[PDB]
Amino acid sequence: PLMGWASTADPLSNLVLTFSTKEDAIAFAEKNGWSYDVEERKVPKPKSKSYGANFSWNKRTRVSTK
Amino acid sequence: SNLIEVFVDGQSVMVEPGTTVLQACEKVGMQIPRFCYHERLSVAGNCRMCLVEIEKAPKVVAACAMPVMKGWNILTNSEKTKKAREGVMEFLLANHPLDCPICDQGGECDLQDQSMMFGSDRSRFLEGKRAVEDKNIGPLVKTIMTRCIQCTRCIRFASEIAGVDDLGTTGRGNDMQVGTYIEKMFMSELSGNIIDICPVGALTSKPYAFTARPWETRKTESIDVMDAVG
Amino acid sequence: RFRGEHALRRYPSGEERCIACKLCEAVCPAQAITIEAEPRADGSRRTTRYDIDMTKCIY
Amino acid sequence: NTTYKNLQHHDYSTYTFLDLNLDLSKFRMPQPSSGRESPRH
Amino acid sequence: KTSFGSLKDEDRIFTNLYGRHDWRLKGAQSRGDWYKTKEILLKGPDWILGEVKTSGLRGRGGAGFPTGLKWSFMNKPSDGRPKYLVVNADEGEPGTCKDREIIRHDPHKLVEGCLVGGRAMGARAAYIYIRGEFYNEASNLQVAIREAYEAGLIGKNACGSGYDFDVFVVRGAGAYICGEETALIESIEGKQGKPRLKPPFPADVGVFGCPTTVANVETVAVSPTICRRGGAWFASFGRERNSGTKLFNISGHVNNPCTVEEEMSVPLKELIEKHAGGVTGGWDNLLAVIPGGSSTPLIPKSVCETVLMDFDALIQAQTGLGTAAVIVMDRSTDIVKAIARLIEFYKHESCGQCTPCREGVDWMNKVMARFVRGDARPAEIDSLWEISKQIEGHTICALGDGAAWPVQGLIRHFRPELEERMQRFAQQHQ
Amino acid sequence: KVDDAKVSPPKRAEMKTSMESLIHHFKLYTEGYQVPPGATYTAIEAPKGEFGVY
Amino acid sequence: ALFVHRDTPKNNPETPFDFTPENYKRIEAIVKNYPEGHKAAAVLPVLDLAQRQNGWLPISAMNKVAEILQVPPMRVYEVATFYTMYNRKPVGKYHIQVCTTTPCMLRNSDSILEAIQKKLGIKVGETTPDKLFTLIEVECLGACVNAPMVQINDNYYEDLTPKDIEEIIDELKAGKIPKPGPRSGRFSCEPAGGLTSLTEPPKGPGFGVQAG
Lengths: 66, 230, 59, 41, 430, 54, 212
Ligand SMILES: Cc1cc2nc3c(=O)[nH]c(=O)nc-3n(C[C@H](O)[C@H](O)[C@H](O)COP(=O)(O)O)c2cc1C
Ligand code: SF4
Ligand code: SF4
Ligand code: SF4
Ligand code: SF4
Ligand code: SF4
Ligand code: FES
Ligand code: FES
Description:
part of a larger assembly, 7 chains, C: mainly beta, 1 helix, globular, F: alpha+beta, two-stranded antiparallel ribbon, 2 helices, 2 strands, 33% helix, elongated, binds flavin mononucleotide, binds iron/sulfur cluster
């Protein structure tokens, strides 16, 4: 109410716990006490790509500007 | 059966034919510095940054678009590998204006991160650096034509996905301009999805433009609304 | 090289020298620099909220 | 031979190339299509 | 063996350098076009490839490719995609005057060569790309096409045999990069004129996705005469490794600069003086000699007085051999200004795929202009050596290398003139 | 200072003219230079004694 | 250097414009000369036809060509601005190109250049203060065995000299064109001497043949 700053009543807002696995994450969460929600790890699916696929006589990939 | 032996610095890995050097290095854990490649867009060998050295190879090739034959071995820490990358890095940072404060992607650049981790330090070319007049691509995307490193990632995106096909290159050599020839505005679908694709701070967001800076914002998971896809 | 008042300069016969590039918040160790920018009524990038917390500044 | 045995080119008009291309428009090998008429068909 | 090349008549390859008997298929039939060619065409492709690899024909065009190896890479079986023969009728590398002369004088021998090439390696049709500045000789080729089609000797079922073959001539619109190998192909393909990457070769995807090949006018114009003339005798011309007959284009500061026909190997002093004029005022008057034209480092006096003109000799003499642009320059001119004009040419004609040629030709333009005016200290000239070693082989095409080589030759041989120039301008600036 | 602009920030003339100096300035004062992992210790002869930093 | 639109007069499409249907028959001949499935190869000859119809090319011609040849027009503008045949600044009839690079500079280019400069008056790259005379210098055109050369519209001029400059431009401004061949003798690329090339009228198949 003097500066428009974001004063918070939160100790636990700026924490970030850095882990390497998921089982140890579950182990630490069961060890210290609280509950949690889990996202997966969504790796990029590799797709076949080629410049010789960018050009073709009878396929419809046509850059037409390079 | 389509399991190809390539060696990353001596270590073996099986690689499908047609897949490039870069997907092999992403299989083993390496990355190659790159601009005109993008993992979910088309492939061309424009930006020249991804050069790499093979054992027993007197010809340095661009690793973004190489069909991989059987039995390679790839140097990603060798001598002329770093020499070629530092050379190309000194090339790219000559016609780029001193705008890293007033750029909007100052926290999330690519020239900056690769010029730290792969570049030289004591520059050259004391006089020059021409500049290019801008024109508004629309009301929603702020456009400065000067910071364009001419990587040609927006153009191929438009040509293969957007289908509007009003964004090309004019002129030759040094004097090449990107975008629109007939000064016609670009108001189509996914016109905001070119600020995530332009790897430098050339095509930036008009309404966002000068309201934040990336190293001060904390992030949170969210779901797309006003659609049914999320 | 003495360091006191924390003033601001402006241009020679010109306007505000700051851009709101936020490097001073990025290097201010006690986080006393509070900057929320706005571009002005013409378009060139400038400020709104520029705050040096002199109780926190460590000079 | 002491005379330039060209100079049958000396009388060129503007439309000569394209008029020749129209003059040889016949007996052609069909220049075969492959399905479509354009990639943006 | 011969005495390293000394050409004598009755034993040439192709005639009509300048102003011969006529320009007509009658005169071409007098010179020897369309002589028993059906027995050459209707025989077998490996025999043509063996005549190539026995005669030892060298792949021309300024580069030095192997001929028969590439044309044997052209042996995929004919699937539902045809095969094209793209004739590069252009002139790059300023100094050239190479195939302007051929396509003005003798087009019907190019018709011979393109028919032999199309029937030879399994092609289907020839697309000729001529430079856009060549209206007169391109239209002479058009009238020759109308003559050959009024006779109807090529086309559907050519030479009385079941093998159709057509030639489509496309003019250009003006670029050095149209004279390249693959931006040639995509100047045909109706795109903007910019090359492709090299790991897709023309043996798989060329013109639109046809397995095509790109042929030089020198190799096409020699190509039926290789078969019909003396085999293993074309290998008996000049040096045994790189054997051949070739033009030699002597421009520069000589009496009546022109082009000649010789064999492969020749002493350069014999070539300059004893066949095309000679250096105005004396042999020892000149400042320098450059072979090749624009893709080639320079040659000083003591090297050009003795070195025989061969590819491997020039390569181990640190130079290329281009398209026979062997020109001289006298001491009365600013050779640094000449190099800077070449760099201005490189800036005016280059595309924008690769970042390094674009940025490096910009730096070399501004810095070679500064060396014309002699600005900095020689840390700048060793920095120019640094960038000229940075560019080499880091491109798509060969224009980056062709921008590297004259600067390289300048640094390798003409250090002290630059040193004195920069000291002169430093003392005039002060 | 040292001969490495990726360690020390450059001075004012290079900051106001050269591109690489501004890039190194900007990322060196946002992120700081990257440091390889290591658990090191050293100690100096401070006038109070073995001043150790770990 | 004016490579964006600049909606000037005699521009801002649709400026009123139409072709000849005989030229449409030419267009059908050129599209007949190309394989179907890749129909966009006709852009360069059709656009050359548009230049030979209308001297400097405007933009409504390019829009019409993009409508006919089923391509998006930005590719047509790319191929337009990519070359030096296709000039979009308004030019006239006599389009002087003075070629000067490596031998042409080395054989007195600037004598010819100042001769053209003080004969026409205006600076290089520009045009006269009326129509039909545009002076530009250009890169190599293939008269490398000659003087720095003078190209007018699909015609060459070789082996020039300042008095020949004055006489040729006297006839040009008077409306007379000389022979477009070389000068100073040497009616082809010749050594001017006593036939240092072949002397006997050649035979052909009488001497060495093979497998006949
Ligand atoms: C930068 C560059 C310039 C070239 N200039 C020419 C040229 O002036 N003339 C030509 O016929 N080919 C030119 N080429 C094309 C190659 O010479 C051609 O692809 C090759 O010679 C064809 O193979 P060959 O050895 O059988 O002739 C050039 C290529 C590049 C990359
Ligand atoms: S995009 Fe360019 S101006 Fe922006 S931060 Fe990166 S280098 Fe600086
Ligand atoms: S505008 Fe951005 S994405 Fe497009 S070519 Fe330029 S740098 Fe690349
Ligand atoms: S934001 Fe801070 S560091 Fe940046 S210009 Fe303004 S006062 Fe200076
Ligand atoms: S504590 Fe004070 S002197 Fe130090 S960086 Fe912050 S505002 Fe500047
Ligand atoms: S080196 Fe230059 S001229 Fe050659 S392909 Fe690359 S960008 Fe084009
Ligand atoms: S990513 Fe391979 S060249 Fe740009
Ligand atoms: S340089 Fe003038 S014609 Fe080749």
